[PDB]
Design a protein around this ligand. Structure first.
Ligand SMILES: [Cl-]
Ligand SMILES: [Cl-]
Length: 162
């Protein structure tokens, strides 16, 4: 298991524009297109992202290419973030995957806002961090995905995904 296979499981793959759990226009492997309610604003962003006139549909290759960029951007946001970086540096390889997952789903700013949980993860207080991570809108809105991520932080294994 690795970050890529983990995110592919959590986000699925869709080749046509769809709405995410929050209702936003998305495509591929969890690639948010826009927060705007306009399908046209969405199609426009899409064509801009791919470099061609797509009419809202992409190929698997195109989907995977956006995915590779998005994982890279996710890691880099973590490394550029003064709150995230130290946490990330402190973690083992499996737990690092869980942090990347959260950033990919909710953005750097969002993750950065989990102050208390970040402090607990840095201290390696696994059980306490898991309880604190669960007291969130995130867990309440996407409970199965959150549990998976949380279990990963608690255990340091890929069991939630096997
Ligand atoms: Cl992009
Ligand atoms: Cl869920």
């Amino acid at each position: 298991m690795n970050i890529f296979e983990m995110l592919r499981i959590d986000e699925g793959l869709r080749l046509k524009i769809y709405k995410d759990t929050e209702g936003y226009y998305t495509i591929g492997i969890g690639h948010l297109l826009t927060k705007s309610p306009s399908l046209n604003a969405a199609k426009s962003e899409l064509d801009k992202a791919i470099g061609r006139n797509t009419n809202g549909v992409i190929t698997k290759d195109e989907a995977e290419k956006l995915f590779n960029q998005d994982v890279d951007a996710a890691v880099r946001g973590i490394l550029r973030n003064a709150k995230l970086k130290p946490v990330y540096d402190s973690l083992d390889a499996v737990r690092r995957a869980a942090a990347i997952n959260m950033v990919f789903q909710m953005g750097e700013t969002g993750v950065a806002g989990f102050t208390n949980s970040l402090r607990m993860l840095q201290q390696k207080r696994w059980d306490e961090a898991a309880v604190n991570l669960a007291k969130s809108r995130w867990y309440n809105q996407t409970p199965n995905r959150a549990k998976r991520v949380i279990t990963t932080f608690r255990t340091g294994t890929w069991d939630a995904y096997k």
